[PDB]
């Protein structure tokens, strides 16, 4: 995947997190990206290895 320039690999799943309007990505304790917002449908997906 390549989300707004951020490239990676994994499985995308529907999520239940509610980002604030000014947020685009989310991180875990290890500091890796875990959730993203689709730039077109504006839905939020979870990224799993």
């Amino acid at each position: 995947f390549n989300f707004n320039g951020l490239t990676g690999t994994g499985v995308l799943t529907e999520s239940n997190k509610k980002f604030l309007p000014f947020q685009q990505f989310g991180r875990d304790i290890a500091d890796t990206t875990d959730a993203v917002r689709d730039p077109q449908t504006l839905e939020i997906l979870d990224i799993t290895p």
Partner: protein
């Protein structure tokens, strides 16, 4: 018929707490007490 307050900021280290929804609900100011 109102009031206002004024405080100044300094560089500090804080320990913030996020909840299950992502809201900040607590914090600790490290350079205050032992």
């Amino acid at each position: 018929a109102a009031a206002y307050y004024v405080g100044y900021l300094q560089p500090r280290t804080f320990l913030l707490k996020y909840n299950e929804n992502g809201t900040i609900t607590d914090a600790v100011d490290c350079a205050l007490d032992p």
